[PDB]
Design a protein around this motif. Structure first.
Motif, PDB file in Angstrom:
ATOM      1  N   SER A 103       7.890   0.956  -8.040  1.00 37.29           N
ATOM      2  CA  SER A 103       8.063   2.064  -7.093  1.00 37.29           C
ATOM      3  C   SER A 103       9.233   1.864  -6.135  1.00 37.29           C
ATOM      4  N   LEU A 104       9.362   0.652  -5.590  1.00 35.69           N
ATOM      5  CA  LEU A 104      10.436   0.381  -4.638  1.00 35.69           C
ATOM      6  C   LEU A 104      11.773   0.436  -5.314  1.00 35.69           C
ATOM      7  N   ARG A 105      11.874  -0.116  -6.522  1.00 32.46           N
ATOM      8  CA  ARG A 105      13.117  -0.020  -7.252  1.00 32.46           C
ATOM      9  C   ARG A 105      13.537   1.457  -7.461  1.00 32.46           C
ATOM     10  N   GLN A 106      12.603   2.346  -7.792  1.00 29.79           N
ATOM     11  CA  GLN A 106      12.991   3.765  -7.974  1.00 29.79           C
ATOM     12  C   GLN A 106      13.320   4.418  -6.629  1.00 29.79           C
ATOM     13  N   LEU A 107      12.570   4.058  -5.579  1.00 31.12           N
ATOM     14  CA  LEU A 107      12.820   4.607  -4.242  1.00 31.12           C
ATOM     15  C   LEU A 107      14.161   4.146  -3.666  1.00 31.12           C
ATOM     16  N   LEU A 108      14.510   2.882  -3.901  1.00 30.97           N
ATOM     17  CA  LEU A 108      15.619   2.262  -3.206  1.00 30.97           C
ATOM     18  C   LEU A 108      16.915   2.203  -3.996  1.00 30.97           C
ATOM     19  N   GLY A 109      16.922   2.626  -5.257  1.00 30.37           N
ATOM     20  CA  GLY A 109      18.167   2.652  -6.017  1.00 30.37           C
ATOM     21  C   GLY A 109      18.684   1.254  -6.296  1.00 30.37           C
ATOM     22  N   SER A 110      19.941   1.011  -5.943  1.00 29.58           N
ATOM     23  CA  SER A 110      20.578  -0.261  -6.236  1.00 29.58           C
ATOM     24  C   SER A 110      20.537  -1.229  -5.046  1.00 29.58           C
ATOM     25  N   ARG A 111      19.703  -0.920  -4.058  1.00 30.86           N
ATOM     26  CA  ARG A 111      19.574  -1.824  -2.918  1.00 30.86           C
ATOM     27  C   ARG A 111      18.974  -3.186  -3.295  1.00 30.86           C
ATOM     28  N   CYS A 112      19.176  -4.160  -2.423  1.00 33.09           N
ATOM     29  CA  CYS A 112      18.718  -5.524  -2.641  1.00 33.09           C
ATOM     30  C   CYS A 112      17.234  -5.667  -2.289  1.00 33.09           C
TER      31      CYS A 112
ATOM     32  N   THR B 122       0.841  -1.184   0.000  1.00 33.88           N
ATOM     33  CA  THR B 122       0.000   0.000   0.000  1.00 33.88           C
ATOM     34  C   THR B 122       0.881   1.240   0.000  1.00 33.88           C
ATOM     35  N   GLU B 123       0.252   2.406  -0.134  1.00 32.31           N
ATOM     36  CA  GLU B 123       0.973   3.665  -0.050  1.00 32.31           C
ATOM     37  C   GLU B 123       1.638   3.792   1.334  1.00 32.31           C
ATOM     38  N   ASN B 124       0.959   3.376   2.410  1.00 29.25           N
ATOM     39  CA  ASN B 124       1.582   3.452   3.748  1.00 29.25           C
ATOM     40  C   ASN B 124       2.825   2.568   3.836  1.00 29.25           C
ATOM     41  N   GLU B 125       2.806   1.444   3.124  1.00 33.63           N
ATOM     42  CA  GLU B 125       3.968   0.559   3.037  1.00 33.63           C
ATOM     43  C   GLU B 125       5.129   1.151   2.216  1.00 33.63           C
ATOM     44  N   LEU B 126       4.833   1.978   1.207  1.00 35.60           N
ATOM     45  CA  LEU B 126       5.888   2.728   0.516  1.00 35.60           C
ATOM     46  C   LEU B 126       6.504   3.789   1.431  1.00 35.60           C
ATOM     47  N   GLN B 127       5.682   4.434   2.253  1.00 34.38           N
ATOM     48  CA  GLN B 127       6.221   5.314   3.315  1.00 34.38           C
ATOM     49  C   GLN B 127       7.108   4.548   4.302  1.00 34.38           C
ATOM     50  N   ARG B 128       6.685   3.336   4.675  1.00 34.80           N
ATOM     51  CA  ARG B 128       7.508   2.460   5.549  1.00 34.80           C
ATOM     52  C   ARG B 128       8.867   2.216   4.904  1.00 34.80           C
ATOM     53  N   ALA B 129       8.855   1.829   3.619  1.00 30.83           N
ATOM     54  CA  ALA B 129      10.112   1.593   2.873  1.00 30.83           C
ATOM     55  C   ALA B 129      11.017   2.822   2.864  1.00 30.83           C
ATOM     56  N   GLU B 130      10.442   3.977   2.525  1.00 27.15           N
ATOM     57  CA  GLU B 130      11.198   5.225   2.533  1.00 27.15           C
ATOM     58  C   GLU B 130      11.826   5.531   3.903  1.00 27.15           C
ATOM     59  N   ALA B 131      11.062   5.359   4.974  1.00 30.97           N
ATOM     60  CA  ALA B 131      11.588   5.628   6.317  1.00 30.97           C
ATOM     61  C   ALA B 131      12.714   4.671   6.678  1.00 30.97           C
ATOM     62  N   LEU B 132      12.562   3.378   6.350  1.00 33.52           N
ATOM     63  CA  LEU B 132      13.624   2.387   6.632  1.00 33.52           C
ATOM     64  C   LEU B 132      14.870   2.671   5.827  1.00 33.52           C
ATOM     65  N   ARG B 133      14.678   3.038   4.564  1.00 34.30           N
ATOM     66  CA  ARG B 133      15.802   3.472   3.703  1.00 34.30           C
ATOM     67  C   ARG B 133      16.588   4.650   4.362  1.00 34.30           C
ATOM     68  N   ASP B 134      15.865   5.695   4.722  1.00 35.20           N
ATOM     69  CA  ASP B 134      16.449   6.853   5.414  1.00 35.20           C
ATOM     70  C   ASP B 134      17.097   6.497   6.744  1.00 35.20           C
ATOM     71  N   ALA B 135      16.641   5.414   7.373  1.00 36.35           N
ATOM     72  CA  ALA B 135      17.248   4.949   8.610  1.00 36.35           C
ATOM     73  C   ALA B 135      18.473   4.054   8.406  1.00 36.35           C
ATOM     74  N   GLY B 136      18.815   3.717   7.151  1.00 35.25           N
ATOM     75  CA  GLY B 136      20.039   2.937   6.866  1.00 35.25           C
ATOM     76  C   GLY B 136      19.835   1.532   6.297  1.00 35.25           C
ATOM     77  N   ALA B 137      18.583   1.119   6.124  1.00 37.51           N
ATOM     78  CA  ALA B 137      18.269  -0.232   5.612  1.00 37.51           C
ATOM     79  C   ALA B 137      18.691  -0.394   4.178  1.00 37.51           C
ATOM     80  N   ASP B 138      19.313  -1.533   3.892  1.00 43.01           N
ATOM     81  CA  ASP B 138      19.770  -1.841   2.536  1.00 43.01           C
ATOM     82  C   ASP B 138      19.168  -3.123   1.939  1.00 43.01           C
ATOM     83  N   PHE B 139      18.457  -3.916   2.754  1.00 42.45           N
ATOM     84  CA  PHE B 139      17.885  -5.181   2.294  1.00 42.45           C
ATOM     85  C   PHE B 139      16.383  -5.187   2.595  1.00 42.45           C
TER      86      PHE B 139
END
Length: 323
Positions: free
Chosen positions: A129-138, A93-110
């Protein structure tokens, strides 16, 4: 036709290696983003993996995948308590994309996108969406049960694909909908795709782990073998009787699957009951048994590595008498 772990046995093969050989269990995904000495991931279920479990697995050369049934701030803080590489899980969901963004900003790579039926338009949309948000992360994505599903997720940008629907694992899915694929057929079929497969389901013994890897998985996810052990979430309760148990009320992973299966409707009126799981002593022993079984399997196969185990795959199908 379709086969699960108990349907097969692996056939011993010429072993050219010295008797006290140091046996390598390390596995690296097809894209080179993930390497684990012990290619096992504790399940992203709320009864299995929070920071304590993730840290335990990391200490053994393995890894945890944190579940997603936390608020975003709880999830951030639980991630920050993880020492070493850990998967964080997100939904669609959109709230889950916000979750991903926050974890990314907190240092998550996987990251692990984890849904009941991933071979679906809205999941492909999520992965884009996650691929564009997360770059080259796994990004690991699941679950699928076919080559078409695995290839689909790869096309939408998943790095690693998690296989297993509920045909050799979630009893509820098979019972309630009739859908599933026995795990070895599933693993073999999905592993035709050009990304690593994580086997997720039906794994009961270290022997099943050997079979899952031999049939083409590069990593395995385990939940049941760890359930009730010390590093799992939940306090230990010692009841009158002397036995020790972990006790769960809310069961968020199980409830999410029951919701998907259409079973969490207005007429589900029975009073809520606690779920008790026997305390598992000695998690260190459970992991050592798995490591031992896996090295011993590689020895029977005359294999130098998991790659060689897979390349030299030789098995027979057995009957019930064959057990």
């Amino acid at each position: 036709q379709a086969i699960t772990f108990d349907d097969v046995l692996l056939v011993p093969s010429y072993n050219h290696h010295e008797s006290r050989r140091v046996v390598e269990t390390t596995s690296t995904d097809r894209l080179g983003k993930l390497t684990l000495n012990l290619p096992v991931i504790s399940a992203n279920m709320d009864t299995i993996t929070e920071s304590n479990m993730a840290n335990f697995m990391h200490s053994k050369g393995a890894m945890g995948a944190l579940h997603r049934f936390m608020t975003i701030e709880e999830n951030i803080q639980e991630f920050k308590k993880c020492k070493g590489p850990v998967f964080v899980s997100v939904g669609c969901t959109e709230n889950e994309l916000q979750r991903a963004e926050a974890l990314r900003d907190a240092g998550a790579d996987f990251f692990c996108v984890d849904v009941a039926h991933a071979h679906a338009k809205y999941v492909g949309k999520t992965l884009k969406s996650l691929r564009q948000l997360l770059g080259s992360r796994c990004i690991m994505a699941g679950n699928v049960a076919t080559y078409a599903g695995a290839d689909y997720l790869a096309s939408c940008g998943a790095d690693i694909i998690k296989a297993g629907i509920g045909g050799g694992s979630v009893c509820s899915t098979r019972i309630k909908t009739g859908f599933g694929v026995p795990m070895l057929t599933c693993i073999q079929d999905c592993s035709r795709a050009d990304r690593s497969i994580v086997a997720d389901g039906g794994i009961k013994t270290s022997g099943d782990i050997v079979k899952a890897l031999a049939f083409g998985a590069d990593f395995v996810m385990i939940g049941g073998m760890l359930a009730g052990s010390a590093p799992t979430p939940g306090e230990v309760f010692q009841k009158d009787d002397g036995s020790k148990v972990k006790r769960y009320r809310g069961m968020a992973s199980r409830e999410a699957q029951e919701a998907f299966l259409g079973q969490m409707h207005e007429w589900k009126t029975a009073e809520g009951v606690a779920t008790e799981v026997p305390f598992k002593e000695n998690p260190d022993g459970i992991i050592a048994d798995i490591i031992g079984g896996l090295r011993s399997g590689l020895t029977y196969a005359g294999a130098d590595s998991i790659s060689e185990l897979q390349r030299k795959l030789n098995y027979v199908i057995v009957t019930q008498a064959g057990r």
